[PDB]
């Protein structure tokens, strides 16, 4: 009968730090009618061995704020990406209040809702549960504060053989304010290098190194010779360079003009994959690689780019204009193109009787001296994911973007205490995150590129409600606008 909290949504900009509070209204049904239930592919029919899974479904729900737009309004995002060279979370504050427990009775043929109980909520800060917040699932807080949202169910996959389980599988029976401290992670880079990796040279001055210009004098027999030249501004492809572009694993090139595509079903057969334990798994999104060569921007790598759906997009077999295809154009400078080879290598030893033969490199692992940019983060895209706990990993930053962590924000589980009686709950959730910023000190003379909302005339206002009250985000928003030297 007396309020347990207030309504906090706003963003403070203090110096180099940003404090973004967000509050929403939530609704928690009762999943599995207070049960734990085995699930597997066989319940769903399990036709393919690639999709074969085994696991349990639990009544609990979980709060997931893991997407950026939960914490930033499009203005705060524009304000963030335009004025900063980097950001990263510092502290996390979380509060849960205004709990309301309703009971639904059916009297005659009509339903009645009246007050009633307790609500179970706890966090797993020892990371003893499976961590499902990193898969970019749904059920996160709505981008728009006036939306009331439903809490997702919590279930976890374990070791499987086809549909069947194995002796090494585990079963987890999961049987208000707190604060959090993010572990130290590198500042996400939100700038586009002005210079390409190959052009780092001084254009006015020669190198003192020599290369092999001519292996023959002219057309004829026994014309072999060795001639050398100075590598310089006239021919820049041959200069010696200290650093080389990052790794690549090639993607198939799909074109958004459909008549250029091959007339066959190459969607699954064609696609890049990584086999594990006999289960072919698509490579998505894959290593961070540019989407296309300049001018080829109509092409996009098959599996290699985050695709977000527009507001209202159907679930299955939607057209191309119902989905928003992001593209890593900004990182083209230091990274190979996803649809192109990493280079060529010599396949044999030349001699008098044999020509020098080279061949393509389709995939290339790390070599010493490689440099690369990671994949961008978006208004929609994820914030963090938990680094798998293993003996080893390399550059743990996740492939879908964001901040890879060995101790991410804990899972927050909630369910309605059983009494059965048809019951559900609702309330308010406020999550506060402190961010830290890195200012651009650049002395670049000409004006930067900035993210601007084009002055347009249209029926509706972008990033705002339409006549029926449906908030909508028009396009995926990148974080990379300002520039820095390579």
């Amino acid at each position: 009968g007396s309020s347990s909290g207030n309504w906090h949504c706003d963003s403070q900009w203090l110096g180099d730090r940003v404090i973004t509070t967000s509050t929403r209204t939530w609704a928690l049904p009762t999943y599995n009618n207070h049960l734990y239930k085995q699930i597997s592919n066989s319940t769903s029919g399990g036709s393919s061995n690639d999709n074969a899974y085994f696991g349990y479904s639990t009544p609990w729900g979980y709060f997931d704020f893991n997407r950026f737009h939960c914490h930033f309004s499009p203005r705060d995002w524009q304000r963030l990406i335009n004025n900063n060279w980097g950001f990263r979370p510092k502290r996390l504050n979380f509060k849960l209040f205004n709990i309301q427990v309703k009971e639904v009775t059916d009297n005659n043929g009509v339903k009645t809702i009246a007050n009633n109980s307790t609500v179970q909520v706890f966090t797993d800060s020892d990371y003893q549960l499976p961590y499902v917040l990193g898969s970019a699932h749904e059920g996160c807080l709505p981008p728009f504060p006036a939306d009331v949202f439903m809490i997702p169910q919590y279930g976890y996959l374990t070791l499987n053989d086809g549909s069947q389980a194995v002796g090494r599988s585990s079963f987890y029976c999961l049987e208000f304010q707190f604060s959090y401290e993010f572990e130290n992670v590198p500042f996400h880079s939100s700038y586009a290098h002005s210079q390409s990796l190959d052009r780092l040279m001084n254009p006015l001055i020669d190198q003192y190194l020599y290369y092999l210009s001519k292996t023959i004098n002219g057309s004829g027999q026994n014309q072999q010779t060795l001639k050398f030249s100075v590598a310089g501004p006239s021919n820049m492809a041959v200069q010696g360079r200290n650093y080389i572009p990052g790794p690549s694993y090639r993607q198939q090139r799909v074109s958004t003009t459909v008549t250029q595509n091959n007339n066959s079903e190459f969607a699954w057969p064609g696609a890049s994959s990584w086999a594990l334990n006999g289960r072919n798994s698509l490579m998505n999104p894959g290593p961070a690689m540019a989407s296309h060569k300049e001018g080829e921007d109509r092409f996009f790598p098959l599996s290699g780019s985050l695709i977000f759906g527009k507001q209202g997009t159907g679930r299955d077999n939607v057209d191309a204009d119902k989905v928003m295809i992001t593209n890593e154009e900004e990182i083209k400078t230091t990274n190979p193109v996803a649809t192109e080879s990493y280079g060529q290598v010599a396949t044999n030893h030349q001699s008098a009787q044999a020509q020098a033969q080279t061949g393509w490199v389709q995939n290339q692992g790390i070599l010493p001296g490689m440099v690369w940019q990671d994949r961008d983060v978006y208004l929609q895209g994820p914030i963090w994911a938990k680094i798998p706990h293993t003996d080893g990993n390399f550059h743990p930053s996740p492939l879908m973007g964001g901040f890879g962590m060995k101790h991410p924000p804990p899972q927050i589980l909630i369910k309605n205490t059983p009494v059965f009686i048809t019951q559900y709950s609702t309330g308010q959730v406020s999550v506060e995150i402190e961010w830290e910023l890195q200012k651009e000190n650049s002395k670049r003379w000409n004006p930067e590129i900035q993210y601007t909302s084009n002055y347009y005339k249209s029926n509706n206002v972008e990033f705002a409600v339409n006549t029926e009250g449906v908030y909508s985000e028009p396009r995926p928003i990148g974080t990379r606008y300002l520039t820095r030297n390579l």
Partner: antibody
Amino acid sequence: EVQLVESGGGLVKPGGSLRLSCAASGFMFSSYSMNWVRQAPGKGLEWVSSISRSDSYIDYADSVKGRFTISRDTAMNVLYLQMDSLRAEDTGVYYCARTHVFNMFREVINDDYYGMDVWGQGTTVTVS
Amino acid sequence: SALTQPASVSGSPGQSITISCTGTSSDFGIYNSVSWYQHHPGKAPKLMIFGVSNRPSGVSNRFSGSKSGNTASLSISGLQAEDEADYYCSSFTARSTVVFGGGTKLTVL
């Protein structure tokens, strides 16, 4: 993916009248100029008429002036060219293009012209 | 009309090609506008060059342009079989009309 699809091309005796529509999709249709061009059989492209961003300025090629009326409904993005008093020279393939401006917020009143940006495949209008 | 452009040009693969259209009075290239279009038969024409030489996002680097005095010219390099199309030049005019040249069909051998 920005697409403009022309429609309504057909066969009409001289002196008749044809209405051509251009269905715009994928972009804001009311923020751009839109205009019609014409390719006669065995000839290069020719320009017909235009309509501004706020519909204030309607322009016409000298030849078709007074015989055509360009206008856009805007309730549902579409474009309309009313062809009246057709001649034998009005045979061709009509295209629907949109002049492309990178920034719609003008900084200066006289802006250097940048040309058409998105085109349709065009429809064939034939007179007999 | 009003922009004189050669009937057809041709070149072998790999060779550069200069297509050039000329115009009369002042209004040729009034403001910055001299614009080059690529028209494949039966498909939508593309704006190869906007401005005297600026080229849009979609266009390949091979295409280029310049305007010297009264003459503007489109220069195609690294010629290929896919560059075979019709090429038109256009310029905004003082009455806020656009004017297309007759156009050059480039047949690569």
